[PDB]
Coordinates of C-alpha atoms in Angstrom, one line a residue:
Chain A
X1 CA 65.1 -9.0 85.1
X2 CA 61.4 -10.7 85.5
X3 CA 60.0 -13.0 83.1
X4 CA 56.1 -13.9 83.0
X5 CA 54.9 -17.2 81.4
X6 CA 51.1 -17.0 80.4
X7 CA 50.0 -20.5 79.8
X8 CA 52.4 -21.9 82.5
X9 CA 50.2 -25.2 83.4
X10 CA 50.1 -26.5 80.1
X11 CA 52.8 -29.2 78.5
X12 CA 54.8 -26.2 76.9
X13 CA 54.5 -23.8 80.0
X14 CA 55.7 -26.6 82.5
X15 CA 58.7 -27.4 80.3
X16 CA 59.4 -23.7 79.8
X17 CA 59.0 -22.8 83.4
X18 CA 61.3 -25.5 84.6
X19 CA 64.1 -24.6 81.9
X20 CA 63.7 -20.9 83.0
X21 CA 63.8 -21.8 86.8
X22 CA 67.2 -23.5 86.4
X23 CA 68.5 -21.3 83.5
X24 CA 67.8 -17.8 84.3
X25 CA 70.6 -15.7 85.7
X26 CA 70.8 -15.3 89.6
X27 CA 68.6 -12.5 90.8
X28 CA 65.9 -13.0 88.1
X29 CA 62.3 -13.5 88.9
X30 CA 59.9 -15.8 87.2
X31 CA 56.2 -15.5 87.5
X32 CA 53.6 -18.2 86.1
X33 CA 50.0 -17.4 85.1
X34 CA 47.3 -19.9 83.8
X35 CA 43.5 -20.2 84.4
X36 CA 44.1 -23.8 85.4
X37 CA 44.0 -23.8 89.2
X38 CA 47.1 -25.9 89.7
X39 CA 49.3 -23.0 88.6
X40 CA 50.2 -21.5 92.1
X41 CA 51.4 -25.1 92.8
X42 CA 53.4 -25.4 89.7
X43 CA 55.5 -22.4 90.9
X44 CA 55.7 -23.9 94.5
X45 CA 57.1 -27.2 93.0
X46 CA 59.6 -25.4 91.1
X47 CA 60.2 -23.3 94.1
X48 CA 61.9 -26.3 95.8
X49 CA 64.8 -26.0 93.1
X50 CA 67.6 -24.4 94.8
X51 CA 68.4 -21.7 92.2
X52 CA 68.7 -17.9 92.9
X53 CA 65.4 -17.4 90.8
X54 CA 62.2 -16.2 92.6
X55 CA 59.1 -18.0 91.3
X56 CA 55.5 -17.5 92.0
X57 CA 52.4 -18.8 90.4
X58 CA 49.0 -17.5 89.9
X59 CA 45.6 -18.5 88.5
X60 CA 42.2 -16.8 88.2
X61 CA 41.0 -14.6 85.3
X62 CA 43.3 -11.7 86.2
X63 CA 46.9 -11.9 85.0
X64 CA 47.9 -8.4 86.6
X65 CA 49.8 -9.9 89.6
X66 CA 52.1 -12.2 87.4
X67 CA 52.4 -9.3 84.9
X68 CA 53.5 -6.4 87.4
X69 CA 57.1 -5.1 86.6
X70 CA 57.5 -7.9 83.8
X71 CA 60.4 -7.3 81.3
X72 CA 59.6 -10.4 79.2
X73 CA 56.2 -11.9 78.5
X74 CA 55.9 -15.4 77.1
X75 CA 52.6 -16.4 75.9
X76 CA 52.1 -20.3 75.4
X77 CA 48.5 -20.4 76.6
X78 CA 45.8 -22.4 74.3
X79 CA 44.9 -25.8 73.1
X80 CA 46.1 -27.9 70.1
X81 CA 43.2 -30.4 69.0
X86 CA 35.9 -28.3 64.7
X87 CA 39.1 -26.7 63.3
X88 CA 37.2 -23.3 63.2
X89 CA 36.1 -23.7 66.7
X90 CA 39.9 -24.4 68.1
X91 CA 41.2 -21.3 66.2
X92 CA 38.4 -19.0 67.6
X93 CA 39.5 -20.5 71.0
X94 CA 43.0 -19.9 70.6
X95 CA 42.8 -16.6 69.0
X96 CA 40.4 -15.4 71.9
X97 CA 43.0 -16.3 74.5
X98 CA 45.8 -14.5 72.7
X99 CA 43.7 -11.2 72.3
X100 CA 42.8 -11.4 76.0
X101 CA 46.4 -12.1 77.5
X102 CA 47.9 -9.5 75.4
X103 CA 45.2 -7.1 76.4
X104 CA 46.4 -7.8 80.1
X105 CA 49.9 -7.3 79.1
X106 CA 49.0 -4.1 77.4
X107 CA 47.3 -2.7 80.7
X108 CA 50.0 -3.9 83.2
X109 CA 53.4 -4.2 81.3
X110 CA 53.2 -2.4 78.0
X111 CA 56.8 -1.9 77.6
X112 CA 57.7 -5.6 78.1
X113 CA 59.0 -7.8 75.3
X114 CA 56.3 -10.1 74.1
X115 CA 57.0 -13.6 72.9
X116 CA 54.2 -15.2 71.4
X117 CA 54.3 -19.0 71.3
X118 CA 50.6 -19.8 71.0
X119 CA 49.8 -21.2 67.6
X120 CA 49.3 -20.4 64.7
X121 CA 51.9 -17.9 65.2
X122 CA 51.5 -16.4 61.6
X123 CA 48.1 -15.4 62.7
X124 CA 48.5 -14.7 66.5
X125 CA 51.2 -12.1 66.2
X126 CA 49.0 -10.1 64.0
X127 CA 46.1 -10.4 66.8
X128 CA 48.7 -9.2 69.1
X129 CA 49.9 -6.4 67.3
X130 CA 46.2 -5.1 66.6
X131 CA 45.5 -5.6 70.3
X132 CA 48.6 -3.4 71.3
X133 CA 47.7 -0.7 68.7
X134 CA 44.1 -0.3 70.0
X135 CA 45.6 0.2 73.3
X136 CA 48.1 2.7 72.0
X137 CA 51.3 0.9 73.5
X138 CA 52.4 -0.9 70.2
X139 CA 56.2 -1.1 69.7
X140 CA 57.1 -3.3 66.7
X141 CA 60.7 -3.8 68.3
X142 CA 59.1 -5.7 71.4
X143 CA 56.8 -8.2 69.6
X144 CA 57.9 -11.5 68.3
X145 CA 56.6 -14.7 67.2
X146 CA 58.6 -17.4 68.5
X147 CA 59.9 -19.5 65.7
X148 CA 62.9 -20.9 67.5
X149 CA 61.6 -24.6 67.4
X150 CA 62.0 -24.4 63.4
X151 CA 65.6 -23.5 64.0
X152 CA 66.3 -26.2 66.5
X153 CA 64.8 -28.9 64.4
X154 CA 66.7 -27.6 61.4
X155 CA 70.1 -27.8 63.1
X156 CA 69.0 -31.4 64.6
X157 CA 68.2 -32.8 61.0
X158 CA 71.2 -31.2 59.4
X159 CA 73.6 -32.6 62.0
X160 CA 72.2 -36.1 61.8
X161 CA 72.3 -36.0 57.9
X162 CA 75.7 -34.4 57.8
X163 CA 77.3 -36.2 60.7
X164 CA 77.9 -32.9 62.4
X165 CA 78.1 -31.8 66.1
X166 CA 74.3 -30.9 66.7
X167 CA 75.5 -28.0 68.9
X168 CA 77.7 -26.5 66.1
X169 CA 75.1 -26.4 63.5
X170 CA 73.0 -23.2 63.3
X171 CA 70.5 -23.0 60.3
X172 CA 68.9 -19.6 59.5
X173 CA 65.1 -20.0 59.0
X174 CA 62.9 -17.3 57.5
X175 CA 59.2 -16.8 56.6
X176 CA 56.7 -18.0 59.1
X177 CA 55.8 -20.8 61.3
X178 CA 53.6 -23.2 59.5
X179 CA 53.8 -25.6 56.6
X180 CA 55.3 -23.9 53.2
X181 CA 55.8 -20.6 55.1
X182 CA 58.8 -22.2 57.0
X183 CA 61.8 -21.7 55.0
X184 CA 65.2 -23.0 56.3
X185 CA 68.1 -21.4 54.5
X186 CA 70.2 -24.7 54.0
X187 CA 72.3 -22.8 51.5
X188 CA 73.7 -20.7 54.1
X189 CA 75.1 -23.2 56.5
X190 CA 78.7 -22.7 57.0
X191 CA 80.8 -25.8 56.2
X192 CA 77.9 -27.9 54.9
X193 CA 76.6 -28.4 51.4
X194 CA 73.3 -30.2 50.0
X195 CA 72.1 -32.1 47.0
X196 CA 68.9 -30.7 45.6
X197 CA 67.2 -34.1 46.8
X198 CA 68.6 -33.2 50.4
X199 CA 67.5 -29.8 50.3
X200 CA 64.0 -30.9 49.0
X201 CA 63.8 -33.9 51.6
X202 CA 65.1 -31.6 54.5
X203 CA 63.0 -28.6 53.8
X204 CA 59.7 -30.8 53.8
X205 CA 60.6 -32.7 56.8
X206 CA 61.3 -29.4 58.6
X207 CA 57.9 -28.1 57.3
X208 CA 56.2 -31.1 58.5
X209 CA 57.9 -31.8 61.8
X210 CA 55.0 -30.8 63.9
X211 CA 52.9 -33.5 62.2
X212 CA 55.8 -36.0 62.8
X213 CA 55.3 -35.4 66.6
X214 CA 51.8 -35.4 66.6
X215 CA 51.6 -38.7 64.8
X216 CA 54.1 -40.6 67.2
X217 CA 52.0 -39.3 70.1
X218 CA 49.0 -41.1 68.8
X219 CA 46.5 -38.6 70.0
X220 CA 48.3 -37.4 73.2
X221 CA 49.1 -34.1 71.3
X222 CA 51.7 -32.0 69.7
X223 CA 55.2 -30.7 70.7
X224 CA 55.6 -29.6 74.4
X225 CA 59.0 -30.5 75.6
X226 CA 61.0 -29.5 72.4
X227 CA 58.7 -26.3 72.1
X228 CA 59.6 -25.4 75.9
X229 CA 63.3 -26.0 74.9
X230 CA 62.9 -23.6 72.0
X231 CA 60.9 -21.0 73.8
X232 CA 63.5 -21.1 76.7
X233 CA 66.4 -20.4 74.2
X234 CA 64.5 -17.4 72.8
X235 CA 63.5 -16.0 76.2
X236 CA 67.0 -16.2 77.6
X237 CA 68.2 -14.5 74.4
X238 CA 66.0 -11.7 75.2
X239 CA 67.0 -11.6 78.7
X240 CA 70.7 -11.5 77.9
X241 CA 70.1 -8.7 75.2
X242 CA 68.2 -6.7 77.7
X243 CA 70.8 -6.8 80.4
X244 CA 73.2 -5.3 77.6
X245 CA 74.9 -8.3 76.1
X246 CA 76.3 -7.8 72.6
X247 CA 75.9 -9.9 69.4
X248 CA 72.8 -11.5 70.6
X249 CA 70.9 -12.7 67.2
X250 CA 68.0 -14.7 66.9
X251 CA 65.6 -15.4 64.1
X252 CA 61.8 -14.5 65.0
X253 CA 58.6 -13.4 63.2
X254 CA 58.2 -9.6 63.5
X255 CA 56.8 -6.6 61.9
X256 CA 59.4 -5.1 59.4
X257 CA 59.9 -3.4 56.2
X258 CA 57.0 -5.3 54.6
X259 CA 59.0 -6.4 51.6
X260 CA 57.5 -10.1 51.7
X261 CA 54.5 -9.5 54.2
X262 CA 53.7 -7.4 57.2
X263 CA 55.0 -9.9 59.5
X264 CA 58.2 -11.9 58.6
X265 CA 60.7 -14.0 60.3
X266 CA 64.2 -12.9 59.8
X267 CA 67.6 -12.7 61.6
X268 CA 67.2 -10.1 64.4
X269 CA 70.0 -8.4 66.5
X270 CA 68.4 -8.0 69.8
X271 CA 69.2 -5.5 72.3
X272 CA 68.1 -3.2 75.4
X273 CA 65.0 -2.3 73.7
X274 CA 64.2 -5.6 71.9
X275 CA 65.0 -5.4 68.2
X276 CA 68.2 -3.7 67.6
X277 CA 68.5 -4.5 64.0
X278 CA 66.4 -6.4 61.4
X279 CA 69.3 -8.1 59.6
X280 CA 69.3 -8.9 56.1
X281 CA 68.2 -12.4 54.9
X282 CA 71.1 -12.4 52.7
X283 CA 71.8 -14.4 49.3
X284 CA 69.1 -17.2 48.5
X285 CA 69.6 -20.1 46.5
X286 CA 67.2 -20.7 43.3
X287 CA 65.2 -23.1 45.4
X288 CA 65.1 -20.8 48.4
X289 CA 64.0 -18.0 46.1
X290 CA 61.3 -20.2 44.7
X291 CA 60.0 -21.4 48.2
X292 CA 59.7 -17.7 49.6
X293 CA 57.6 -16.5 46.3
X294 CA 55.6 -19.6 46.5
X295 CA 54.6 -19.0 50.2
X296 CA 53.9 -15.3 50.1
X297 CA 50.1 -15.5 49.6
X298 CA 49.6 -18.1 52.3
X299 CA 51.5 -15.9 54.8
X300 CA 49.5 -12.9 54.0
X301 CA 46.3 -14.8 54.3
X302 CA 47.5 -16.0 57.9
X303 CA 48.3 -12.2 58.6
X304 CA 44.9 -11.0 57.4
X305 CA 43.0 -13.5 59.4
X306 CA 44.6 -12.3 62.5
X307 CA 43.9 -8.6 61.7
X308 CA 40.3 -9.3 61.0
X309 CA 39.9 -11.3 64.3
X310 CA 40.4 -8.1 66.1
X311 CA 39.1 -5.2 63.9
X312 CA 36.2 -7.1 62.4
Chain B
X1 CA 76.2 -44.6 78.6
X2 CA 72.7 -45.5 77.9
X3 CA 70.1 -44.4 80.3
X4 CA 66.4 -46.0 80.3
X5 CA 63.5 -44.0 82.1
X6 CA 60.4 -46.4 83.0
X7 CA 57.5 -44.2 83.6
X8 CA 58.6 -41.6 81.0
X9 CA 55.0 -40.2 80.0
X10 CA 54.2 -39.0 83.6
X11 CA 54.8 -35.5 84.9
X12 CA 58.1 -36.6 86.6
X13 CA 59.2 -38.8 83.6
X14 CA 58.6 -36.0 81.0
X15 CA 60.6 -33.6 83.3
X16 CA 63.4 -35.9 83.9
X17 CA 63.5 -37.1 80.1
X18 CA 63.7 -33.3 79.0
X19 CA 66.7 -32.7 81.6
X20 CA 68.4 -35.8 80.4
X21 CA 68.2 -35.1 76.8
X22 CA 70.2 -31.7 77.2
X23 CA 72.4 -32.7 80.2
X24 CA 73.5 -36.2 79.4
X25 CA 77.2 -36.4 78.1
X26 CA 77.5 -36.3 74.4
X27 CA 77.4 -40.0 72.8
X28 CA 74.8 -41.0 75.5
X29 CA 71.6 -42.8 74.5
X30 CA 68.4 -42.3 76.2
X31 CA 65.4 -44.8 76.1
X32 CA 61.9 -43.9 77.2
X33 CA 59.5 -46.5 78.3
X34 CA 55.8 -46.1 79.5
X35 CA 52.5 -48.4 79.1
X36 CA 51.0 -45.0 77.7
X37 CA 50.8 -44.9 73.9
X38 CA 52.0 -41.4 73.9
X39 CA 55.6 -42.4 74.9
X40 CA 57.3 -43.1 71.4
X41 CA 56.2 -39.6 70.5
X42 CA 57.4 -38.0 73.9
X43 CA 60.8 -39.3 72.6
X44 CA 60.2 -38.1 68.8
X45 CA 59.4 -34.6 70.6
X46 CA 62.6 -34.6 72.6
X47 CA 64.6 -35.7 69.3
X48 CA 64.2 -32.5 67.9
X49 CA 66.4 -31.1 70.6
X50 CA 70.0 -30.5 69.0
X51 CA 72.1 -32.3 71.5
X52 CA 74.4 -35.4 70.9
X53 CA 72.0 -37.7 72.7
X54 CA 70.1 -40.2 70.8
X55 CA 66.5 -40.8 72.3
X56 CA 63.8 -43.5 71.4
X57 CA 60.4 -44.0 72.9
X58 CA 58.7 -47.3 73.6
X59 CA 55.1 -48.4 74.9
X60 CA 53.0 -51.7 75.3
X61 CA 53.6 -54.1 78.0
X62 CA 57.3 -55.1 77.2
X63 CA 60.1 -52.7 78.3
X64 CA 62.6 -55.0 76.7
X65 CA 63.6 -52.8 73.5
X66 CA 63.8 -49.7 76.0
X67 CA 66.3 -51.9 78.3
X68 CA 68.5 -53.7 75.9
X69 CA 72.1 -52.4 76.6
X70 CA 70.9 -50.1 79.4
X71 CA 73.7 -49.0 81.9
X72 CA 71.2 -46.8 84.2
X73 CA 67.6 -47.5 84.7
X74 CA 65.4 -44.9 86.4
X75 CA 62.0 -45.8 87.5
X76 CA 59.7 -42.9 88.1
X77 CA 56.6 -44.9 86.9
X78 CA 53.5 -44.6 89.3
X79 CA 50.5 -42.3 90.4
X80 CA 50.5 -39.8 93.1
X81 CA 46.7 -39.4 92.8
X82 CA 43.8 -41.3 91.2
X83 CA 40.0 -40.8 91.4
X84 CA 38.6 -43.0 94.1
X85 CA 41.9 -44.4 95.3
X86 CA 43.2 -44.0 98.8
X87 CA 46.6 -44.2 100.2
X88 CA 46.4 -48.2 100.4
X89 CA 45.0 -48.4 96.8
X90 CA 47.6 -46.2 95.3
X91 CA 50.3 -48.3 97.2
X92 CA 49.0 -51.5 95.8
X93 CA 49.1 -49.9 92.2
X94 CA 52.8 -48.4 92.7
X95 CA 54.1 -51.3 94.4
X96 CA 52.6 -53.6 91.5
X97 CA 54.1 -51.4 89.0
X98 CA 57.7 -51.4 90.7
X99 CA 57.5 -55.3 91.0
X100 CA 56.6 -55.5 87.3
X101 CA 59.2 -53.2 86.0
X102 CA 62.0 -54.4 88.1
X103 CA 61.3 -58.0 87.0
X104 CA 61.7 -56.7 83.3
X105 CA 65.0 -55.0 84.3
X106 CA 66.4 -58.3 86.0
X107 CA 65.6 -60.1 82.6
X108 CA 67.1 -57.7 80.1
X109 CA 69.8 -55.5 81.8
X110 CA 70.5 -57.1 85.4
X111 CA 74.0 -55.4 85.6
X112 CA 72.4 -51.9 85.3
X113 CA 72.3 -49.3 88.2
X114 CA 68.8 -49.1 89.2
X115 CA 67.1 -45.9 90.5
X116 CA 63.9 -46.2 92.4
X117 CA 62.0 -42.8 92.0
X118 CA 58.4 -44.5 92.8
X119 CA 57.0 -43.8 95.9
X120 CA 57.0 -44.9 98.9
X121 CA 60.8 -45.3 98.3
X122 CA 61.3 -46.7 101.7
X123 CA 59.2 -49.7 100.7
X124 CA 59.5 -49.9 96.8
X125 CA 63.3 -50.3 96.8
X126 CA 62.8 -53.3 99.2
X127 CA 60.4 -54.7 96.6
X128 CA 62.9 -54.1 93.9
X129 CA 65.6 -56.0 96.0
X130 CA 63.2 -58.8 96.6
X131 CA 62.4 -59.0 93.0
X132 CA 66.1 -59.1 91.9
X133 CA 67.1 -61.7 94.4
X134 CA 64.4 -64.0 93.0
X135 CA 65.9 -63.7 89.7
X136 CA 69.3 -64.1 91.0
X137 CA 70.8 -61.2 90.0
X138 CA 70.7 -58.9 93.1
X139 CA 73.7 -56.4 93.3
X140 CA 73.4 -54.5 96.5
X141 CA 75.8 -51.8 95.1
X142 CA 73.5 -51.1 92.2
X143 CA 70.0 -50.6 93.6
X144 CA 69.3 -47.2 94.9
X145 CA 66.2 -45.2 96.3
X146 CA 66.2 -41.6 95.0
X147 CA 66.1 -39.4 97.9
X148 CA 67.8 -36.4 96.1
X149 CA 64.6 -34.2 96.3
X150 CA 65.0 -34.3 100.1
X151 CA 68.4 -32.8 99.7
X152 CA 67.6 -30.0 97.2
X153 CA 64.6 -29.0 99.2
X154 CA 66.7 -28.8 102.3
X155 CA 69.3 -26.8 100.4
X156 CA 66.5 -24.5 99.3
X157 CA 65.1 -23.9 102.7
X158 CA 68.4 -23.5 104.4
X159 CA 69.7 -21.1 101.8
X160 CA 66.6 -18.9 102.3
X161 CA 66.7 -18.9 106.0
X162 CA 70.4 -18.1 106.4
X163 CA 70.8 -15.8 103.4
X164 CA 73.0 -18.1 101.6
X165 CA 73.2 -18.6 97.6
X166 CA 71.0 -21.6 96.9
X167 CA 73.5 -23.1 94.7
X168 CA 76.1 -22.8 97.6
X169 CA 74.3 -25.0 100.2
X170 CA 74.5 -28.6 100.4
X171 CA 72.6 -30.3 103.3
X172 CA 73.3 -34.1 104.2
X173 CA 69.9 -36.0 104.5
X174 CA 70.0 -39.5 105.8
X175 CA 67.6 -42.3 106.8
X176 CA 64.8 -42.9 104.5
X177 CA 62.3 -40.8 102.2
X178 CA 59.0 -40.1 104.2
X179 CA 57.9 -38.4 107.2
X180 CA 60.0 -39.0 110.4
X181 CA 62.6 -41.2 108.5
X182 CA 63.8 -38.1 106.6
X183 CA 66.6 -36.5 108.8
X184 CA 68.4 -33.6 107.5
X185 CA 71.8 -33.3 109.1
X186 CA 71.7 -29.4 109.7
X187 CA 74.3 -29.7 112.4
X188 CA 76.8 -30.4 109.5
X189 CA 75.9 -27.3 107.5
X190 CA 79.0 -25.0 107.1
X191 CA 79.3 -21.3 108.5
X192 CA 75.9 -21.5 110.3
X193 CA 74.1 -22.8 113.4
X194 CA 70.5 -23.1 114.0
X195 CA 68.5 -22.7 117.1
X196 CA 66.5 -25.9 118.4
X197 CA 63.3 -24.1 117.3
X198 CA 64.9 -23.7 113.8
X199 CA 65.9 -27.5 113.6
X200 CA 62.5 -28.4 114.7
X201 CA 60.5 -26.0 112.1
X202 CA 63.1 -26.7 109.2
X203 CA 63.1 -30.5 110.0
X204 CA 59.3 -30.6 109.8
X205 CA 59.1 -28.3 106.7
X206 CA 61.5 -30.8 105.0
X207 CA 59.5 -33.9 106.2
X208 CA 56.2 -32.4 104.8
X209 CA 57.3 -30.5 101.8
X210 CA 55.3 -32.6 99.3
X211 CA 52.1 -31.6 101.1
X212 CA 52.9 -27.8 100.3
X213 CA 52.9 -28.6 96.7
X214 CA 49.7 -30.7 97.0
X215 CA 47.9 -27.9 98.7
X216 CA 49.2 -25.1 96.4
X217 CA 47.9 -27.3 93.3
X218 CA 44.4 -27.0 95.0
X219 CA 44.7 -30.9 95.5
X220 CA 44.8 -31.1 91.8
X221 CA 48.4 -32.4 91.6
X222 CA 51.7 -33.5 93.2
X223 CA 55.5 -32.4 92.9
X224 CA 56.6 -33.4 89.3
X225 CA 59.2 -30.9 88.1
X226 CA 61.4 -30.5 91.1
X227 CA 61.2 -34.2 91.4
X228 CA 62.3 -34.6 87.8
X229 CA 65.1 -32.1 88.5
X230 CA 66.2 -34.1 91.6
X231 CA 66.3 -37.4 89.7
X232 CA 68.3 -35.8 87.0
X233 CA 71.0 -34.7 89.4
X234 CA 71.0 -38.2 90.7
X235 CA 71.2 -40.0 87.4
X236 CA 73.9 -37.5 86.0
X237 CA 76.0 -38.3 89.3
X238 CA 75.5 -41.9 88.4
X239 CA 76.6 -41.4 84.9
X240 CA 79.6 -39.5 85.6
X241 CA 80.8 -42.0 88.3
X242 CA 80.0 -44.9 85.8
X243 CA 82.3 -43.1 83.2
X244 CA 85.1 -43.0 85.7
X245 CA 84.7 -39.8 87.5
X246 CA 86.1 -39.6 91.1
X247 CA 84.9 -37.7 94.1
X248 CA 81.1 -38.3 93.2
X249 CA 79.1 -38.2 96.3
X250 CA 75.4 -38.4 96.6
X251 CA 72.8 -39.2 99.3
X252 CA 70.8 -42.3 98.4
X253 CA 68.8 -45.3 100.1
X254 CA 70.7 -48.5 99.8
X255 CA 71.3 -51.8 101.4
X256 CA 74.3 -51.4 103.5
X257 CA 75.7 -52.6 106.8
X258 CA 72.4 -52.6 108.6
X259 CA 73.7 -50.8 111.8
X260 CA 70.4 -48.8 111.5
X261 CA 68.1 -50.8 109.0
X262 CA 68.6 -53.1 106.0
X263 CA 68.1 -50.1 103.8
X264 CA 69.3 -46.7 104.8
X265 CA 70.1 -43.3 103.2
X266 CA 73.5 -41.9 103.7
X267 CA 76.5 -40.2 101.8
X268 CA 77.7 -42.5 99.0
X269 CA 80.8 -42.4 97.1
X270 CA 79.8 -43.4 93.4
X271 CA 82.2 -45.5 91.3
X272 CA 82.2 -47.5 88.1
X273 CA 80.2 -50.4 89.7
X274 CA 77.5 -48.3 91.5
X275 CA 78.2 -47.9 95.2
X276 CA 81.9 -47.6 95.8
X277 CA 81.6 -46.5 99.6
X278 CA 79.0 -46.1 102.1
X279 CA 80.4 -43.3 103.9
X280 CA 79.9 -42.2 107.5
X281 CA 77.0 -40.2 108.7
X282 CA 79.2 -38.3 110.8
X283 CA 79.0 -36.6 113.9
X284 CA 75.2 -36.1 115.1
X285 CA 73.7 -33.3 117.2
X286 CA 71.5 -34.5 120.1
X287 CA 68.3 -33.6 118.2
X288 CA 69.7 -35.6 115.3
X289 CA 70.7 -38.8 117.3
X290 CA 67.2 -38.7 119.1
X291 CA 65.5 -38.4 115.6
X292 CA 67.5 -41.3 114.1
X293 CA 66.7 -43.6 116.9
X294 CA 63.0 -42.7 117.1
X295 CA 62.6 -43.1 113.2
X296 CA 63.9 -46.7 113.3
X297 CA 60.6 -48.7 113.9
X298 CA 59.0 -46.9 111.1
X299 CA 61.8 -47.5 108.7
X300 CA 61.7 -51.1 109.5
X301 CA 58.1 -51.6 109.1
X302 CA 58.4 -49.8 105.7
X303 CA 61.1 -52.4 104.5
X304 CA 59.3 -55.4 105.8
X305 CA 56.1 -54.3 103.8
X306 CA 58.2 -54.5 100.5
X307 CA 59.4 -58.0 101.4
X308 CA 55.6 -59.1 102.1
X309 CA 54.5 -57.6 98.8
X310 CA 56.8 -59.7 96.7
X311 CA 56.8 -62.9 98.8
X312 CA 53.1 -63.0 99.6

């Protein structure tokens, strides 16, 4: 299986590429692309790690050599911090990269990491549609960082093994759109104050990092970790492994919005089943309805960026 | 166990810290320190990873709160490259950094195992030793120059050449950590043999492998990610042995029985008190014996440079 990382020279991309180099299965191939000229050397650096994963790095404007034969494409290109100017830049980047994906490896599974995910998977979808290669089963907004933060915060609050906690997270990927299903964590229960506090902490966790970094940026290492978990799940599922389940932001039945993060059974063709979000608590139900307009705006912003 | 990383905001430090956060035994503590104000947030970043490893980040000039109760200290601080600075300039910066950070270590956690990652390792562990002696806390069994990157590079190049699985090759590497002081013991690699031309070419590839990264990065950077992977292998081996695991062997640059130089890299059995046994380098080929003898002047100059730096 071959994985391409577009945006490989960034903080998220290097973390991701490191975890993938040492965690992909033997006989996997890893290729790195970024416009930054260090990129062939990021690959060379990683190539000195004795694992059975072939790795190569590529720069320039054309991502084609990185993309040829790619089974999974993970996109983490873009900056983090006018606010209109930076969005236009990140959106432009996703639009371009996905267009390269569409030309070279249209049957790849595509993980969009670049933020704002609510909006950027919509951009991605529209680009793939205009190329005529859009498969809704193979495009994902990578929301996995929401899940692993949730697992961490629950484990610390409830004194649990952090690796034994797995919290479902549905909705979208920013602020009020992030909905952790704390009522569904097996063997743990929460107070209403705890639900309100945990939920707000999860929804604002990116700001927590930004603030402690004192202008040195947003989450990079946890995000590379999150994205690795997700890419390795897609890989496992593509190789035929069963019961691989991840939450991710995908185009589904449209009950809440056109794109929505829900539990997914993953398979040989990407999404094998969009699973039910199950029973919500009153607090969760209210949180779902209170966010829907926000998420629909995020989506529309992405559709308009492409279609004018 | 508690592990402190000094230089935690650089490329190597962040790669190291990320790897340690996931790979340290459950119940471990991880502190990060770097002068750069980002550092507390690099830790907050990492803290969102659901492993049983508590992590906290620290900045300013005082490494003390990172250092309190530390069992292992890994020093990756320093610069590989800097505008307007030449090799000699870069050396004075890195040596100053190490001298400072080791003084802080000697004050707060003098019984920690100490891993020097900052280059040049041949010189900077000698600086470290001189610092710790001045403080009255030098433990010869607890100071190591981290040479692991030479080993994993050698494992990589040998596996590729001889059609072996990369995870299956383990090349001994002795001596020091740069240029001709790096000696891979290719004569001691199982199943296979090498032609003289192969030893010559592999040895040189191993001695200059960092240049290879610098060049591929268009001179825009150095090896960071593979160095972080190498330092994590080292630091994890140290942690296992300090926790009481047996049969933990690593090559590292340490003060020993100065048969070759005062500091020298060789197979080490690791134990609960740092170095448990400095093991024999074994039987050398003719090429190897010659290479060893020929590196020794350089190695000794590298070491004396360290002592000069501290003791004016």
